[PDB]
Amino acid sequence: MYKVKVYVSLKESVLDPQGSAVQHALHSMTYNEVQDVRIGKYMELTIEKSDRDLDVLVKEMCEKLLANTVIEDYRYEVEE
Amino acid sequence: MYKVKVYVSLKESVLDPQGSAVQHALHSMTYNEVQDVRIGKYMELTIEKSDRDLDVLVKEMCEKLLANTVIEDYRYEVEE
Amino acid sequence: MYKVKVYVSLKESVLDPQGSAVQHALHSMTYNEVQDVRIGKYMELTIEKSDRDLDVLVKEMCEKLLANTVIEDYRYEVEE
């Protein structure tokens, strides 16, 4: 069946304090080479064939539960 | 300058209650085609070159901060 | 009309890798005073009275949708 990878991330149009804090933490740990840090959610969904088309199913789930399209962008990839 | 993509996910032998809870809700919402849900993290770190080797640096950041390697696996890809 | 507060948290005997990962990061960020981290969900549902008993209704919503009772505990409090 299918392995669907979903990436959910804060829209770039929003201040990201958490990413800033992680970047600073890395510097404090002496990994001063870091210039920017971005952290998002990564999901792996195993999906079995059904009457619904795969693309319709995934977006429906991201629009309703896996994401808040008001403040986050989401994208996906499918593998077998 | 490099852009490091890091994928953090629970080890195969580790149960993922967060995903298991999401799977349950999805099922109640009629998405019974979802067989399994694994929730992890995706990150993009921009880094400058230094005296440190690329492989040595990414592994340290991952083991020391990005992932709790006792329960999480990590894999990375680098682009210019 | 009632306001139902629901607290969903992993059962004591269930490991919480999400929290364990957050705990690890917190430690690296110098917050070693954190001994344990358990991550769950909090919800507030506004409901109208009906023929259903209050206790019967809240338990069904919790068991059927709000929480995956195989791994999660739930407790609720109600206000007017």
Added chain:
Amino acid sequence: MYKVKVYVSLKESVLDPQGSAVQHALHSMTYNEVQDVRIGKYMELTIEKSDRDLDVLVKEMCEKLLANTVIEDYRYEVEE
């Protein structure tokens, strides 16, 4: 030691599609009495005494990692 309860929620000033979807799901399941649904994150942090004051520690952690104060509100309660 201390048991700190942290509640992280989307600011009321933001559209909440996920809450809307859960509300609709409840109606579809015949729990039509539901009028509104709000879902937030609930965390339980066990904290041991240190040189830092408890209130300073908690807010620092919420401002840096446990929350994104741009889109979410957070509050906490402490018990022994």
